[PDB]
Amino acid sequence: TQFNPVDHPHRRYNPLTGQWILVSPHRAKRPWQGAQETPAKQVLPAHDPDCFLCAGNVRVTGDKNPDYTGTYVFTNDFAALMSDTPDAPESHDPLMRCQSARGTSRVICFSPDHSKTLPELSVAALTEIVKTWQEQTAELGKTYPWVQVFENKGAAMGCSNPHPGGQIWANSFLPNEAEREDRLQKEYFAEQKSPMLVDYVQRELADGSRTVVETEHWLAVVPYWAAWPFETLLLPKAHVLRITDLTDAQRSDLALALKKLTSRYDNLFQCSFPYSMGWHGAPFNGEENQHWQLHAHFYPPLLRSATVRKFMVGYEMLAETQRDLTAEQAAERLRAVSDIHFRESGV
Amino acid sequence: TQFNPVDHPHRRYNPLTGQWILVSPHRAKRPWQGAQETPAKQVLPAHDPDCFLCAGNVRVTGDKNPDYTGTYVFTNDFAALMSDTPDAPESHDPLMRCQSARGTSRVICFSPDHSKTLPELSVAALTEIVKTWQEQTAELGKTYPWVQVFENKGAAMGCSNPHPGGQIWANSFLPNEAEREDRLQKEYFAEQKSPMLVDYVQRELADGSRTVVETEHWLAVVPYWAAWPFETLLLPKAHVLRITDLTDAQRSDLALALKKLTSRYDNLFQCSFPYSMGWHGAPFNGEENQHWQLHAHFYPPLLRSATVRKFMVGYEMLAETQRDLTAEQAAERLRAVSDIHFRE
Numbered sequence: 001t002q003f004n005p006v007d008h009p010h011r012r013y014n015p016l017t018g019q020w021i022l023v024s025p026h027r028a029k030r031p032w033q034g035a036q037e038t039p040a041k042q043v044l045p046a047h048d049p050d051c052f053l054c055a056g057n058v059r060v061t062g063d064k065n066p067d068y069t070g071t072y073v074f075t076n077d078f079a080a081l082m083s084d085t086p087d088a089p090e091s092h093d094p095l096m097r098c099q100s101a102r103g104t105s106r107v108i109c110f111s112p113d114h115s116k117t118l119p120e121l122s123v124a125a126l127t128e129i130v131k132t133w134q135e136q137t138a139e140l141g142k143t144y145p146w147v148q149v150f151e152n153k154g155a156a157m158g159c160s161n162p163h164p165g166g167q168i169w170a171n172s173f174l175p176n177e178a179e180r181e182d183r184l185q186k187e188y189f190a191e192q193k194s195p196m197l198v199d200y201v202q203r204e205l206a207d208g209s210r211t212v213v214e215t216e217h218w219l220a221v222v223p224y225w226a227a228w229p230f231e232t233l234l235l236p237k238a239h240v241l242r243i244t245d246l247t248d249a250q251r252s253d254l255a256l257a258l259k260k261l262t263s264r265y266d267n268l269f270q271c272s273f274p275y276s277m278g279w280h281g282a283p284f285n286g287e288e289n290q291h292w293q294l295h296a297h298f299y300p301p302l303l304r305s306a307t308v309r310k311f312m313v314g315y316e317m318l319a320e321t322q323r324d325l326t327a328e329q330a331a332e333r334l335r336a337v338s339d340i341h342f343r344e345s346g347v
Numbered sequence: 348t349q350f351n352p353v354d355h356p357h358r359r360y361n362p363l364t365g366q367w368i369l370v371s372p373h374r375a376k377r378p379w380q381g382a383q384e385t386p387a388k389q390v391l392p393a394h395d396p397d398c399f400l401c402a403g404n405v406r407v408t409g410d411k412n413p414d415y416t417g418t419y420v421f422t423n424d425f426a427a428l429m430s431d432t433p434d435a436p437e438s439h440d441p442l443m444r445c446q447s448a449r450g451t452s453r454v455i456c457f458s459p460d461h462s463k464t465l466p467e468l469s470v471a472a473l474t475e476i477v478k479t480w481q482e483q484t485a486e487l488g489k490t491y492p493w494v495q496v497f498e499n500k501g502a503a504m505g506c507s508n509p510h511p512g513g514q515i516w517a518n519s520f521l522p523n524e525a526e527r528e529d530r531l532q533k534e535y536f537a538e539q540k541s542p543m544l545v546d547y548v549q550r551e552l553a554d555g556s557r558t559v560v561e562t563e564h565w566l567a568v569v570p571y572w573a574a575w576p577f578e579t580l581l582l583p584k585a586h587v588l589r590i591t592d593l594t595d596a597q598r599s600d601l602a603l604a605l606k607k608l609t610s611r612y613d614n615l616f617q618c619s620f621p622y623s624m625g626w627h628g629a630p631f632n633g634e635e636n637q638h639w640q641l642h643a644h645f646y647p648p649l650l651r652s653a654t655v656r657k658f659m660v661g662y663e664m665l666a667e668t669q670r671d672l673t674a675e676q677a678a679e680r681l682r683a684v685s686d687i688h689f690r691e
């Protein structure tokens with residue numbers, strides 16, 4: 001038989017992590033008698049008097065939020081890391097070893113509007129968010145080699161607070177992902193003479209099967225090696241080391257691409273579409289970071305619909321990630337919808 | 348100041364995978380206004396006339412299940428892998444490349460009792476289950492180097508059917524987990540001249556702080572580098588390459604261990620505790636595998652209660668896993684309950 005990626009299971013390589021992805025084209029034809037997701041509520045207030053994240057409201061700790069009108073950043077009340085944690089007793093023990101961990105955690109409210117998600121925000125507003133991401137990265141980076149910007153959107157994605165926003169966690173070390181991506185890029189670079197993702201963006205621009213968003217300065221695709229159903233990879237077209245390096249143009253442009261990508265996401269099932277996303281850029285380790293290329297990852301769980309998600313368990317935990325749909329199928333369905341939030345379009 | 352693992356964040360190494368785990372011991376004190384789980388129904392019938400897995404029932408494909416006793420294994424009606432899949436196009440491209448993927452997938456019904464989960468089954472029954480895992484393993488190992496026994500239990504664990512059971516998927520390659528565990532274990536052995544998990548086992552024996560279940564032949568602990576809140580690692584005290592290598596005693600003993608471990612898990616929150624579990628053993632690759640050590644992993648999502656789970660998202664996806672309680676605190680919680688099923 002002729003090999004048919006659409007019907008034939010195969011494995012794809014993720015050069016960023018060095019891991020394989022199992023693709024099993026028809027897996028989703030099976031009966032689904034499992035959990036049924038709960039789609040988001042259609043009626044929220046712009047201000048929730050009981051929301052710890054709302055403006056002019058008191059946090060769980062009694063501390064009062066300012067009367068913020070834009071973005072708002074504050075040290076997380078339950079930080080995951082601290083700047084002064086004492087050093088751990090480090091050994092060379094090949095069985096049980098530990099290491100120190102310092103840093104901080106900040107929370108960012110995208111806006112005071114309790115009911116407005118990224119896709120529903122102005123490009124201006126979005127531009128503010130980027131500026132904030134930048135401001136945060138630069139300050140923190142002055143102190144920690146790894147600054148991780150991220151966001152958890154929706155209950156299916158473990159958010160513990162319903163207010164629109166993200167987080168930043170700084171680390172004194174290079175976390176798993178960062179060390180891996182760092183090393184792999186560096187090796188590619190040393191070998192190929194060019195940045196791995198810079199070349200990748202080129203190939204994708206020329207192909208288009210996996211393209212979901214394209215703007216002047218940005219490209220969002222369902223990466224070849226994507227793991228989650230509708231996972232996307234957001235990259236600048238030009239070579240950029242960190243978020244702090246973007247020009248104001250690439251910056252306002254980013255806002256636009258974000259609006260587009262998130263709008264498509266919500267348009268996919270005509271509902272708030274949950275996910276975990278975050279930025280990866282060169283570490284502030286004072287080294288040669290030429291091999292780096294700034295990028296954002298979007299890991300959403302929804303699969304068959306608004307109430308049917310993908311579960312990365314069982315074989316996927318004990319062996320390897322296994323996808324039901326191809327990256328090409330995913331991109332296609334994403335290209336199919338409008339890039340204007342249904343709420344904004346009125347359609 | 349003086350470091351205190353229960354007060355100070357730090358990172359622990361997973362030598363099986365070469366990955367680090369971020370420990371942040373006070374994280375679960377933050378308010379939780381997120382999702383609430385829905386705990387498994389306590390009352391179900393022994394036979395469901397609409398269940399695809401029940402004895403004598405007709406599957407989705409019209410195929411009819413026999414009036415089986417004990418376990419029942421069948422080829423998955425929607426197998427993720429096939430024996431004859433055409434080879435893929437092999438390239439060495441540094442950006443976009445693929446590889447062939449062959450194998451099979453089987454479904455294992457633990458027993459005819461649609462209502463009896465693992466901890467609720469007799470040791471005898473549990474033994475039959477182990478015999479089947481063995482049979483399957485030896486069978487499939489004849490053709491595939493990688494045999495994956497596993498189980499998805501509970502809606503929270505993306506199980507797609509309620510009947511009690513698991514799955515066995517075989518592969519023509521070594522999946523990610525398998526390749527790294529093989530490599531790291533091999534490297535350790537070359538250096539220590541002893542199997543990594545075998546030594547591990549001893550070290551835990553001489554500690555007990557992470558111990559959760561211990562029988563004559565088995566040991567179950569919350570591994571030092573555990574990821575999931577109440578994650579356990581279940582392994583034989585003696586060097587065993589694969590599940591098919593177990594002695595009859597070791598096997599009957601595994602059934603016991605299992606019952607004990609699972610009863611403890613259900614007793615933790617007094618509910619059917621969800622998880623994904625699976626066995627890791629030597630591959631059937633004709634190679635020198637003395638560095639291997641059979642072992643089972645249990646990855647349960649529950650954290651705060653029967654309605655509040657742990658979500659491995661955000662920072663955890665983008666950087667590294669972050670635990671809210673230490674392995675020691677977890678193990679302690681597990682030990683505190685009876686190993687007798689609250690409703691046995």
Ligand SMILES: O=c1ccn([C@@H]2O[C@H](COP(=O)(O)OP(=O)(O)O[C@H]3O[C@H](CO)[C@H](O)[C@H](O)[C@H]3O)[C@@H](O)[C@H]2O)c(=O)[nH]1
Nearest residue numbers: 052059060076077078152158159160161377658660661662
């Ligand atoms: O008065 C308050 C109320 C809440 N918070 C903080 O607001 C945050 C809300 O952020 P998220 O909704 O993104 O999620 P959490 O940080 O609560 O937890 C989630 O994100 C983590 C980081 O990725 C882990 O993955 C975790 O398992 C997952 O549930 C929490 O950190 C909480 O500590 C405050 O600082 N003050």
Ligand SMILES: O=c1ccn([C@@H]2O[C@H](COP(=O)(O)OP(=O)(O)O[C@H]3O[C@H](CO)[C@H](O)[C@H](O)[C@H]3O)[C@@H](O)[C@H]2O)c(=O)[nH]1
Nearest residue numbers: 030311313314315399406407423424425499505506507508
């Ligand atoms: O008539 C039927 C009905 C069902 N099945 C099979 O019975 C299995 C039920 O097994 P599980 O409940 O453990 O879960 P699934 O295999 O359906 O899927 C889960 O397990 C997979 C392997 O871990 C993936 O991780 C997937 O994302 C996850 O949701 C399914 O594979 C289904 O194909 C049949 O063979 N015949």
Ligand SMILES: [Fe+3]
Nearest residue numbers: 016181280295
């Ligand atoms: Fe990355």
Ligand SMILES: [Fe+3]
Nearest residue numbers: 363528627644
């Ligand atoms: Fe293992």
Ligand SMILES: [K+]
Nearest residue numbers: 152153159165
């Ligand atoms: K959020």
Ligand SMILES: [K+]
Nearest residue numbers: 499500506512
């Ligand atoms: K099951």
Ligand SMILES: [Zn+2]
Nearest residue numbers: 051054114163
């Ligand atoms: Zn609010």
Ligand SMILES: [Zn+2]
Nearest residue numbers: 398401461510
């Ligand atoms: Zn049944």
